[PDB]
């Protein structure tokens, strides 16, 4: 398939960019986490980044180890995460779906076989977070052969040579960092990314959305105005559901105008 | 690109977010820019041998080999400062950081050994020190805590995950993510990214080197083995670096068999568990089916790295070194055995060694064999946990 193509080119035919909120499956357990999916989307999600619960979460801030945490208080693995990820799919066929994955996760049970599970499910994308592009050939073959985008990330501070990596070697979106750290939406990206976003746009890579520290309406519009496609939100997202555990129809109301707020924000 | 192989055959590599890619060529360099300037070899040999006081002993003993065909040596690593081979590598890593400039270090601990190691090298050396460590170690590691503490170093309680080593692990590579421009991270032993398995190996490397001197000194040839407990791996690969090219010369790793490898509580990844990729590292590592990480258990807390580093992996998969697992029971035996035999108090981690050379010898008592134990530490910090088992025992 072609979803990230495709949203892409509708949204350039809107002058929109994508708000792609992030949230880790399975939190705080699999009915409530398929409930706050599907809110996304209806309140205007573009394109859904998910996390599959991993015990040592290297390059997450404490919202969300605390929702790895939870989904494992609830008992959920892997497969359970992929018979969501088949449902998610039969309900919503354009929506891209990435995953946001660790390394052991993936290699476990051979690499190839991971991959080939994405494709039967409908995953369009997967970032391996602690693969850099130094150890990815074997990550992104293995995708490729499977139709499935493998997401690189491109750093504040990328030089030439990396920039030039990340364009050739990455589809469906260019992840870019704001600021190095781990996720959370206590810290801002305060470096201008412009440079890097032309720069990409020169090296004809996937088209880029800015990551960590989104957490407001104006970071999406500036991220779009800056020249990217888009924006992901995790952190944000994810203290929605942390503050709510306690009031689950609560908990989708407000994480209904936290995203449409946030899409609208992208409009312009 | 990197200036030497982060590989030991398939074992190794260099797994970590990319933000943290300019930290570890940083570091790659700055180390083979060192290990080519004499004035930074002058000063780690200075404060090797006046501050940690190098060598150390190569002691015979002869009253626990009685009537046997064998012949045991204990490097006494027990000697160093600090009472843990530990001490050679912070020294080293903390001339490194001031190397490239940087005036604060980040390290993990899980028993407090390491910690304490690179508090005392930080105040030597006047680096601002901050440790990680899980919570369940900080509330069981009480002395160790507070020799950090004494000497100037910030201690920082981890909650997250499992609130052990592996979770220790995970916050100073967070923290390193984020402030690596000021800040190192002292590793605290032989795994983890590269360039850490190769840079912890060379600055441990001594041990073998005046082992291998001692040992042609008082007996005029190589020794049939050398055996060293495995945690993660520094005390051994430092004992066993300077004779892989000795190819008659065993190498022989211990890992902690806890209450039995059949029992899976045990801290043996090496022959026990299955590849994986974490820390930093393509490595055999403690995981549940579904790849989640599980922790090592044994008696010793210094044995509780989930994994071990990957050149122990490699040596293994070609056939030069050889790794065994040695259970509790056995540990605390050749523990007493020592002290009353030799007058020496060993470390837990290091009785594992003792343990496996002592059935070398029983087992096959007119073999003639020529056996170098590291003792990679002293036991004082042992004698309460053996004196729990001994009393619960009888
Ligand atoms: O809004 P925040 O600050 O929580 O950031 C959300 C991040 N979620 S994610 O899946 O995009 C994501 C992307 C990359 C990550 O690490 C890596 F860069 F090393 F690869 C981790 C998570
Ligand atoms: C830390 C420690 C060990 C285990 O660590 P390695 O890296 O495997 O050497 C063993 N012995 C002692 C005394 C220790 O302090
Ligand atoms: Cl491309
Ligand atoms: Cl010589
Ligand atoms: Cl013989
Ligand atoms: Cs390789
Ligand atoms: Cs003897
Ligand atoms: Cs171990």
């Given at each position: 398939?072609?979803?990230?193509?495709?949203?892409?080119?509708?949204?350039?035919?809107?002058?929109?960019?994508?708000?792609?909120?992030?949230?880790?499956?399975?939190?705080?357990?699999?009915?409530?986490?398929?409930?706050?999916?599907?809110?996304?989307?209806?309140?205007?999600?573009?394109?859904?980044?998910?996390?599959?619960?991993?015990?040592?979460?290297?390059?997450?801030?404490?919202?969300?180890?605390?929702?790895?945490?939870?989904?494992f208080a609830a008992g959920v693995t892997p497969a359970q995460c992929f018979e969501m990820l088949?449902?998610?799919?039969?309900?919503?066929?354009?929506?891209?779906?990435?995953?946001?994955?660790?390394?052991?996760?993936?290699?476990?049970?051979?690499?190839?076989?991971?991959?080939?599970?994405?494709?039967?499910?409908?995953?369009?994308?997967?970032?391996?977070?602690?693969?850099?592009?130094?150890?990815?050939?074997?990550?992104?073959?293995?995708?490729?052969?499977?139709?499935?985008?493998?997401?690189?990330?491109?750093?504040?501070?990328?030089?030439?040579?990396?920039?030039?990596?990340?364009?050739?070697?990455?589809?469906?979106?260019?992840?870019?960092?704001?600021?190095?750290?781990?996720?959370?939406?206590?810290?801002?990206?305060?470096?201008?990314?412009?440079?890097?976003?032309?720069?990409?746009?020169?090296?004809?890579?996937?088209?880029?959305?800015?990551?960590?520290?989104?957490?407001?309406?104006?970071?999406?519009?500036?991220?779009?105005?800056?020249?990217?496609?888009?924006?992901?939100?995790?952190?944000?997202?994810?203290?929605?559901?942390?503050?709510?555990?306690?009031?689950?129809?609560?908990?989708?109301?407000?994480?209904?105008?936290?995203?449409?707020?946030?899409?609208?924000?992208?409009?312009? | 690109?990197?200036?030497?192989?982060?590989?030991?055959?398939?074992?190794?590599?260099?797994?970590?977010?990319?933000?943290?890619?300019?930290?570890?060529?940083?570091?790659?360099?700055?180390?083979?820019?060192?290990?080519?300037?004499?004035?930074?070899?002058?000063?780690?040999?200075?404060?090797?041998?006046?501050?940690?006081?190098?060598?150390?002993?190569?002691?015979?003993?002869?009253?626990?080999?009685?009537?046997?065909?064998?012949?045991?040596?204990?490097?006494?690593?027990?000697?160093?400062?600090?009472?843990?081979?530990?001490?050679?590598?912070?020294?080293?890593?903390?001339?490194?950081?001031?190397?490239?400039?940087?005036?604060?270090?980040?390290?993990?601990?899980?028993?407090?050994?390491?910690?304490?190691?690179?508090?005392?090298?930080?105040?030597?050396?006047?680096?601002?020190?901050?440790?990680?460590?899980?919570?369940?170690?900080?509330?069981?590691?009480?002395?160790?805590?507070?020799?950090?503490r004494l000497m100037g170093a910030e201690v920082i309680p981890v909650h997250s995950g499992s609130?052990?080593?592996?979770?220790?692990?995970?916050?100073?590579?967070?923290?390193?993510?984020?402030?690596?421009?000021?800040?190192?991270?002292?590793?605290?032993?032989?795994?983890?990214?590269?360039?850490?398995?190769?840079?912890?190996?060379?600055?441990?490397?001594?041990?073998?080197?005046?082992?291998?001197?001692?040992?042609?000194?008082?007996?005029?040839?190589?020794?049939?083995?050398?055996?060293?407990?495995?945690?993660?791996?520094?005390?051994?690969?430092?004992?066993?670096?300077?004779?892989?090219?000795?190819?008659?010369?065993?190498?022989?790793?211990?890992?902690?068999?806890?209450?039995?490898?059949?029992?899976?509580?045990?801290?043996?990844?090496?022959?026990?568990?299955?590849?994986?990729?974490?820390?930093?590292?393509?490595?055999?590592?403690?995981?549940?089916?579904?790849?989640?990480?599980?922790?090592?258990?044994?008696?010793?807390?210094?044995?509780?790295?989930?994994?071990?580093?990957?050149?122990?992996?490699?040596?293994?998969?070609?056939?030069?070194?050889?790794?065994?697992?040695?259970?509790?029971?056995?540990?605390?035996?050749?523990?007493?055995?020592?002290?009353?035999?030799?007058?020496?108090?060993?470390?837990?981690?290091?009785?594992?060694?003792?343990?496996?050379?002592?059935?070398?010898?029983?087992?096959?008592?007119?073999?003639?064999?020529?056996?170098?134990?590291?003792?990679?530490?002293?036991?004082?910090?042992?004698?309460?946990?053996?004196?729990?088992?001994?009393?619960?025992?009888?």
């Open positions: 398939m072609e979803r990230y193509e495709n949203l892409f080119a509708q949204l350039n035919d809107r002058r929109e960019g994508a708000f792609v909120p992030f949230v880790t499956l399975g939190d705080p357990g699999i009915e409530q986490s398929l409930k706050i999916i599907d809110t996304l989307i209806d309140a205007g999600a573009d394109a859904l980044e998910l996390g599959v619960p991993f015990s040592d979460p290297l390059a997450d801030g404490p919202t969300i180890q605390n929702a790895n945490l939870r989904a088949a449902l998610i799919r039969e309900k919503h066929p354009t929506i891209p779906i990435g995953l946001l994955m660790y390394a052991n996760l993936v290699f476990n049970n051979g690499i190839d076989a991971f991959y080939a599970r994405c494709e039967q499910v409908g995953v369009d994308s997967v970032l391996v977070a602690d693969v850099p592009v130094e150890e990815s050939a074997p990550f992104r073959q293995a995708a490729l052969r499977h139709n499935i985008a493998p997401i690189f990330i491109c750093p504040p501070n990328a030089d030439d040579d990396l920039l030039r990596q990340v364009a050739s070697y990455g589809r469906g979106y260019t992840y870019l960092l704001s600021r190095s750290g781990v996720t959370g939406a206590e810290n801002r990206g305060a470096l201008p990314l412009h440079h890097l976003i032309e720069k990409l746009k020169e090296y004809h890579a996937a088209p880029a959305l800015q990551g960590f520290g989104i957490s407001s309406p104006e970071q999406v519009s500036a991220a779009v105005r800056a020249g990217a496609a888009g924006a992901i939100s995790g952190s944000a997202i994810v203290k929605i559901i942390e503050k709510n555990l306690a009031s689950p129809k609560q908990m989708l109301a407000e994480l209904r105008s936290f995203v449409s707020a946030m899409k609208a924000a992208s409009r312009a | 690109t990197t200036l030497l192989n982060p590989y030991f055959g398939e074992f190794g590599g260099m797994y970590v977010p990319q933000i943290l890619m300019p930290a570890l060529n940083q570091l790659e360099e700055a180390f083979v820019s060192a290990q080519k300037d004499p004035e930074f070899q002058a000063q780690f040999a200075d404060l090797l041998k006046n501050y940690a006081g190098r060598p150390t002993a190569l002691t015979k003993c002869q009253n626990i080999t009685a009537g046997t065909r064998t012949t045991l040596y204990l490097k006494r690593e027990d000697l160093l400062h600090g009472g843990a081979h530990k001490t050679n590598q912070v020294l080293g890593q903390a001339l490194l950081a001031k190397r490239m400039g940087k005036s604060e270090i980040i390290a993990e601990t899980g028993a407090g050994a390491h910690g304490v190691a690179s508090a005392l090298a930080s105040a030597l050396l006047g680096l601002k020190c901050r440790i990680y460590m899980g919570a369940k170690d900080v509330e069981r590691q009480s002395p160790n805590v507070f020799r950090m609130a052990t080593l592996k979770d220790a692990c995970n916050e100073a590579l967070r923290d390193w993510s984020g402030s690596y421009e000021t800040a190192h991270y002292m590793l605290g032993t032989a795994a983890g990214p590269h360039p850490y398995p190769t840079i912890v190996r060379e600055f441990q490397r001594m041990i073998g080197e005046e082992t291998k001197a001692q040992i042609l000194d008082k007996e005029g040839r190589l020794p049939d083995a050398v055996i060293a407990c495995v945690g993660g791996g520094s005390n051994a690969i430092g004992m066993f670096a300077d004779f892989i090219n000795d190819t008659s010369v065993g190498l022989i790793g211990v890992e902690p068999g806890g209450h039995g490898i059949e029992t899976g509580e045990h801290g043996a990844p090496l022959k026990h568990g299955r590849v994986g990729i974490y820390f930093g590292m393509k490595a055999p590592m403690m995981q549940t089916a579904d790849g989640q990480i599980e922790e090592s258990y044994s008696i010793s807390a210094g044995l509780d790295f989930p994994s071990v580093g990957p050149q122990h992996a490699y040596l293994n998969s070609i056939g030069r070194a050889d790794y065994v697992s040695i259970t509790d029971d056995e540990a605390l035996e050749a523990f007493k055995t020592l002290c009353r035999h030799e007058g020496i108090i060993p470390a837990l981690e290091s009785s594992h060694a003792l343990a496996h050379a002592l059935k070398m010898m029983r087992e096959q008592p007119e073999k003639e064999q020529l056996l170098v134990v590291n003792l990679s530490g002293r036991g004082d910090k042992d004698i309460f946990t053996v004196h729990d088992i001994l009393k619960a025992r009888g």
